[PDB]
């Protein structure tokens, strides 16, 4: 798309924070990269985030990702997630993929889902087995996806609250603003990252945004 969704605006606000660059600068940087590679805006923002986590230039991150795609025969998305999971783990990409593949087979999930689980466990400071146990409890209790359950865990950590508090606020946001759960959780997380209120994060994002 050329029109920017709220979802996408929020991701950039997050990336602007991470890079320490104005939102205007982050927009341009994400659009240049989207154009250059012919990828989604979300994927462009991801790449900027991966390079920041790696501590490499964006080109270098792209070079690594393209080489790893060819090596493993995987998508660019998967290669990026492998690099990210490896940067978060502080290990090799080979080790990260090894762990992801074992976990993929165990849980009957995708490699992408497995890599997200590994990254999430690192973000929570727990083992994977613990993170999976806690995510699956939420999945069953609330009737959310495994992905969403993980997102809830992570949002709670960013907020410095329990998962009960995080869910309570997310569902309030859904009812008040008519957003999806995934949206609500992202808003909560972005406001935490920007050092602001829920209202101010959305107000910025709306300035930035064009498509719905």
Distance of CA 156 to the CA centre of its chain: 14
Method: X-ray
Domain residue spans in the chain? 6-208
How far is residue 124's CA from residue 58's CA, in Å, rounded to a whole number?
26
Q: Map the chain to HEC letters.
A: CCCCCHHHHHHHHHHHHHHCCCHHHHHHHHHHHHHHHCCCHHHHHHHHHHHHHHCCCHHHHHHHHHHHHHHHCCCHHHHHHHHHHHHHHCCCHHHHHHHHHHHHHHHCCCHHHHHHHHHHHHHHCCCHHHHHHHHHHHHHHHCCCHHHHHHHHHHHHHHCCCHHHHHHHHHHHHHHHCCCHHHHHHHHHHHHHHCCCHHHHHHHHHHHCCCC
């Amino acid at each position: 798309g050329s029109g920017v969704s709220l979802e996408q605006a929020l991701l950039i606000l997050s990336v602007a924070a991470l890079l320490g660059t104005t939102v205007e600068e982050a927009v341009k940087r994400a659009l240049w990269l989207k154009t250059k590679l012919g990828v989604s805006l979300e994927q462009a923002a991801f790449i900027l985030s991966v390079a920041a986590y790696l501590g490499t230039t964006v080109e270098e991150a792209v070079k690594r990702a393209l080489k790893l795609k060819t090596k493993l025969g995987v998508s660019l998305e998967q290669a990026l997630l492998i690099l990210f999971a490896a940067a978060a783990l502080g290990t090799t990409v080979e080790e990260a993929v090894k762990r992801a593949l074992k976990l993929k087979t165990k849980l009957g999930v995708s490699l992408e889902q497995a890599l997200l689980i590994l990254w999430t466990a690192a973000e929570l400071g727990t083992t994977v087995e613990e993170a999976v146990k806690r995510a699956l409890k939420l999945k069953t209790k609330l009737g959310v996806s495994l992905e969403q359950a993980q997102a809830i865990l992570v949002v709670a950590a960013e907020l410095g609250t329990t998962v009960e508090e995080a869910v309570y606020r997310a569902l309030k946001l859904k009812t008040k603003l008519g957003v999806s759960l995934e949206q609500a959780l992202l808003i909560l997380e972005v406001a935490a990252k920007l050092g602001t209120t829920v209202e101010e994060a959305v107000k910025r994002a709306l300035k930035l945004k064009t498509k719905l």
